[PDB]
């Protein structure tokens, strides 16, 4: 039924219209399953459609709700950047601002040279896990001279 164009190019990422919407839009970063289901419910569109069955007047509404969530009554405890450390905002950072925020957070930490930044610099484990018997990336060392 209705073999129409399926491959979508949503902002800076490729979606396949061969999948269901609630699991197709998770291909974008910052959008998981629990977030995408809510973004699709608030937009009043159906949830049994393949992602190719959406004409150009649904996708636009879906993304404008996906990017301005607090406008459409998506709560605060549910967003992936809350009390933004340097601006006090609440937001979902979605596609490319995610990598920029992550690198900005790592660089902020390394700047004041806190301990987390020093573990991020030396490529070690940042939480409090033992590193004596895990990680194990290098090569075997020979004991016979």
């Amino acid at each position: 039924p209705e073999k129409f164009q399926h491959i979508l190019r949503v902002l800076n990422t490729n979606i396949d219209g061969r999948r269901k919407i609630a699991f197709a839009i998770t291909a974008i970063k910052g959008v998981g399953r629990r977030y995408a289901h809510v973004v699709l419910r608030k937009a009043d569109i159906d949830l049994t459609k393949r992602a190719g069955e959406l004409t150009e007047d649904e996708v636009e509404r879906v993304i404008t709700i996906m990017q301005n969530p607090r406008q459409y009554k998506i709560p605060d405890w549910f967003l992936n950047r809350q009390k933004d450390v340097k601006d006090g905002k609440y937001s979902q950072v979605l596609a490319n601002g995610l990598d920029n925020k992550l690198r900005e957070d790592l660089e902020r930490l390394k700047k004041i040279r806190a301990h987390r930044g020093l573990r991020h610099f030396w490529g070690l484990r940042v939480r409090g896990q033992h590193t004596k018997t895990t990680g194990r990336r290098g090569r075997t060392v020979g004991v016979s001279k």
Partner: protein, 75 residues
């Protein structure tokens, strides 16, 4: 693994072949219909429920993990 490129929904050729197989198959299950054509297997369930609605196939068993139909309780 491998690459099974199945169809997410029918086209007219597969759509007529799906109605031209009804008298042929003694056992009808979603997996058999998936293997005959190139169907995403979750579309085969909808196709068989549609065929059942039109009286074209007869349900012999339905369970959570298995469904079975047969051709018009004949032959």
């Amino acid at each position: 693994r491998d690459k099974l490129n199945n169809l997410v929904l029918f086209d007219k050729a597969t759509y007529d072949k799906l109605c031209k197989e009804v008298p042929n198959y003694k056992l009808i299950t979603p997996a058999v219909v998936s293997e005959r054509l190139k169907i995403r297997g979750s579309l085969a369930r909808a196709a068989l429920q549609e065929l059942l609605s039109k009286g074209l196939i007869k349900l012999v068993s339905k369970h959570r993990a298995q469904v079975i139909y047969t051709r018009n309780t004949k032959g």
